[PDB]
Each structure stands twice: as structure tokens, then as C-alpha cells.
Write a protein that binds this ligand. Structure first.
Ligand code: PNS
Ligand code: 1N2
Lengths: 76, 346
């Protein structure tokens, strides 16, 4: 359900409704999302689940929806 | 598996330290309590490298190179090395610690920066040759943290760029830091004594200045550091209205870009404060002194300031700056109480 929540919060950050969003979609290496989008994600996460420290802000943790959900699950 | 930190050279140093049984973040960084405002501003004319008034914050104090060297009994030395000596220098450093190797952003494919050498050079930690013959490079910045492969030919090309705007050709920082066995068994004791010393420096609240060709550099330590930092940063409240305008001249465009960059660089230093304070908390816990400070969390206070800095430089909204100021005040107030109660038990 957390993976579902992540995908939902990610959807309005995409550039267009055309954009495919799967658990494995690359978000930042592919330039799909920008710095403002990262702010929204970080803010969503500390509002809803866990205050992520700098140590957890890695491309590995944030590049796919599945990685983000993994990050939340592991740190909550 | 790879260690990392908000400043790439610190994450690099953490990986080398771990090779020799030293926990950089807990026993070295975490053992060095510090808080300092720094300003570069107009001093005595002429100062041809003074391009702009500039303000930032530091929790690095004396810095990990001095601390790491004296704690281990080793040396942290910068040198420039000829191409013909680089690989052997890396193998010789490796027996005793390791090497921080400087190189341009564009020489590291994972940074996706083929178009620019960066504002400052990058740094990586070579990790010897893999069984398949490729060199391994450790990336110490959190966002890209990991291990990367590079050919021996590409490694040497990367180390001797032409042109060389950052002047990094053959530039190595050698960390020969392997402690003796007795020293290593005692490291927490040395960290405890470094911990008290930095707390005393912090409460001493010294300050100073020096005139340089790049401007007058002013610093202030201790409880006063963050109030003085906030008062100075108020001077950049023009950023958001200026950034909002769409009639921006090329000058005002530069004003916005450099103002944003001031706050981006500040934000990296807030992140480092969060990282170092968390190191201090882990050190204190392991030392059995957690009862001294009774639940105060300077690591979380600075993490909040960090997040506020991120929002500010990303958006430059009208109220982001005051939110940052609020977060810094809270971190300043947690820091001073934490330091006073911790030092009492040391
Ligand atoms: P914002 O700048 O905080 O956005 C976050 C980011 C992940 C997009 C950002 O940190 C970033 O990747 N910036 C560009 C990376 C780059 O290649 N810059 C030059 C070499 S570091
Ligand atoms: O953390 C460091 C080490 C040197 C440097 O410029 N930084 C800032 C962050 N950073 C990278 O690590 C790659 C590009 C960049 O700006």
C-alpha cells in the first residue's frame, strides 16, 4: 500500500499525464523530475511517514518509486 | 556499504578511515564540536579576488585532516604527483590508509556532467584494481554514493586533464593513518578527550579576521555564531522579490544565481552539521554519557535547518527565508544547552 501511496503522490509531479509511471520508472537519472519535485517528495515523506536525514537522500533511494517506498519502509 | 557524507571529501575520508579501523563520523567528526559563522567582505583595497560579499556556516572546526592525523598518529598530506608515479603512489598510500584523488566532474561518467568541469573539482577514493583488471573508485557524496569502475587508461587521463581549470592534475591527498594496535584500542578515549576540547573551544567563543586578496575573511565561534549568521543573512531578503521579477537584467540574473548559490552552499553546511551532530550523539551514547544531555537532539534541530535551507534555495519564496531563520535559532538554542550539559560530565 505504501508503494501505492508513493506512486499516487508522484503522479501529479510528472510533466504530463502521458508519462508512464511504474515501480521501476527512473525519476531523477532520467531528468524526469527536477529539484522542485524532490522537495515535494521529501516534504510528503516527513509529513506522512518519517523525517529523512541527509544520509538517506541518495539517488539509489529516490530514483524509482519502488526505491522510495523501500526507503520509507526501512526507515519508518 | 560505501560510506558518504554531505561534503564529498568527508565521505571519501570516512571510507579511508574505515579501512584502518577508524569510524570517522563517530570518533573524529563526532568528537569535534564546533559552530562558526564565516563572512568574506570588503577589507583593505585592493582585493582583486573579492567578487561578492559572501556568508556561510561551518561545523567543521579545525577540520578532519588535523583531527584524523593526531588521533591516529599519522599524516594527511596534499601533493602533486607526476603521471608516471600516480599508480605506484596509490598502491603505496593504500598500505597505510588511502588516497583522495582529485578529478573534474566531467571525468566521472556517473556525475552526468560531460559539459562542465564544475565550479570546484570532484574527489574520489581509489580502491585498488579489481580481479578483472579495472580500477575501482569510491564516490563519497551521498547523492551518488557507491563504487564505480574505470579503466587504468581512463583513470590516468582523468587525473591529468588538459586544460586544468581547477589545477588538479596529479593532485592527491594522502591519508597515511593506520594507528598502532595500542592506539586503536584506545580510540574512544582519545575521542572523549577531543570531545571535551572542542566543547571548550565552542564555549570560549573566539573570533577573528584576516585581510586577503580575496577579501577580508571574518569568523566567529560559539553560541554567538548562529545569531550573527542570521543577522547577516537578513541582508539577502532582496532575493525573493528580485527572483520574482521577470524584467531581470543580466546583472540581476547573476545576482539571483549567486544568491541562490550562497544558500545552496549554506544548505550543504547545515547538512554537514546534522551529520556531525548525529556523529556526536552516537559517540556520546557509546561512551555511556547519554544521560548527561537528557534527550536533546541537536542532530534533528540541524536537520530541520537543513530542510529549510533546501526549500529556500529551491523556491526562493517570500517566507522560506524566515522559516530558515526560525530553524537556525532553534538549532542554536539546542546546541548551547546540549554543549553545556555534556561538558559538565566530561
Ligand atoms: P535541487 O538542485 O536540489 O535538485 C536536486 C538534484 C538531485 C536534481 C540536484 O542535486 C542535481 O542533481 N543537480 C545537478 C547534478 C550535476 O550533474 N551537477 C554538476 C556536477 S555535481
Ligand atoms: O561535495 C562536494 C565535493 C566537491 C564538490 O564540488 N562538492 C559539492 C557537490 N558536488 C559533487 O559532489 C558533484 C558535483 C557537485 O556540486
Amino acid at each position: 500500500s505504501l508503494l501505492v501511496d508513493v506512486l499516487e503522490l508522484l503522479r501529479p509531479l510528472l510533466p504530463s499525464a502521458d508519462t508512464e509511471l511504474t515501480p521501476d520508472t527512473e525519476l531523477f537519472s532520467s531528468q524526469l523530475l527536477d529539484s522542485l519535485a524532490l522537495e515535494e517528495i521529501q516534504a510528503a515523506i516527513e509529513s506522512r511517514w518519517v523525517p529523512l536525514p541527509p544520509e538517506e537522500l541518495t539517488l539509489a533511494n529516490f530514483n524509482t518509486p519502488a526505491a522510495i517506498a523501500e526507503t520509507i519502509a526501512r526507515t519508518s | 556499504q560505501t560510506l558518504h557524507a554531505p561534503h564529498c571529501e568527508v565521505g571519501c575520508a570516512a571510507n579511508v578511515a574505515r579501512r584502518v579501523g577508524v569510524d570517522l563520523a563517530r570518533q573524529v567528526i563526532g568528537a569535534h564540536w564546533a559552530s562558526r559563522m564565516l563572512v568574506r567582505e570588503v577589507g583593505t583595497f585592493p582585493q582583486p579576488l573579492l567578487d561578492r560579499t559572501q556568508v556561510t556556516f561551518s561545523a567543521q572546526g579545525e577540520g578532519w585532516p588535523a583531527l584524523l592525523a593526531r588521533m591516529t598518529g599519522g599524516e594527511v598530506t596534499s601533493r602533486h604527483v607526476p603521471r608516471e608515479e600516480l599508480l605506484s603512489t596509490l598502491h603505496a598510500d593504500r598500505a597505510e590508509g588511502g588516497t583522495l584523488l582529485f578529478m573534474e566532474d566531467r571525468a566521472c561518467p556517473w556525475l552526468d556532467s560531460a559539459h562542465s568541469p564544475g565550479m570546484l573539482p570532484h574527489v574520489v577514493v581509489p580502491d585498488g584494481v579489481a580481479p578483472d583488471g579495472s580500477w575501482q573508485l569510491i564516490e563519497g557524496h551521498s547523492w551518488w554514493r557507491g563504487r564505480y569502475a574505470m579503466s587504468e587508461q581512463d583513470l590516468l587521463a582523468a587525473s591529468y586533464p588538459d586544460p586544468d581549470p581547477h589545477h588538479v592534475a596529479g593532485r592527491v591527498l594522502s591519508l597515511r593513518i593506520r594507528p598502532s594496535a595500542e592506539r586503536a584500542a584506545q580510540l574512544d578515549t582519545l575521542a572523549r578527550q577531543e570531545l571535551a576540547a572542542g566543547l571548550r573551544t565552542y564555549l570560549a567563543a573566539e573570533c577573528g579576521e584576516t585581510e586577503t586578496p580575496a577579501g577580508r575573511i571574518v569568523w566567529a565561534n560559539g553560541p554567538q555564531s548562529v545569531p550573527l549568521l542570521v543577522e547577516r543573512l537578513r541582508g539577502w531578503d532582496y532575493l525573493c522579490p528580485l527572483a520574482a521579477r521577470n524584467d531581470l537584467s543580466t546583472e540581476h540574473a547573476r545576482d539571483v544565481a549567486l544568491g541562490r548559490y550562497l544558500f545552496l552552499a549554506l544548505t550543504d553546511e547545515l547538512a554537514f552539521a546534522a551529520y556531525a551532530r548525529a556523529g556526536t550523539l552516537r559517540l556520546v551514547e557509546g561512551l555511556g554519557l547519554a544521560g548527561a544531555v537528557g534527550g536533546l537532539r541537536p542532530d534533528e534541530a540541524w536537520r530541520l535547518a537543513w530542510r529549510s535551507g533546501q526549500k529556500l534555495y529551491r523556491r526562493l519564496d517570500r517566507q522560506n527565508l524566515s522559516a530558515l531563520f526560525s530553524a537556525l535559532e532553534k538549532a542554536a538554542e539546542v546546541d548551547v544547552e546540549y554543549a553545556r550539559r555534556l561538558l559538565k560530565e566530561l
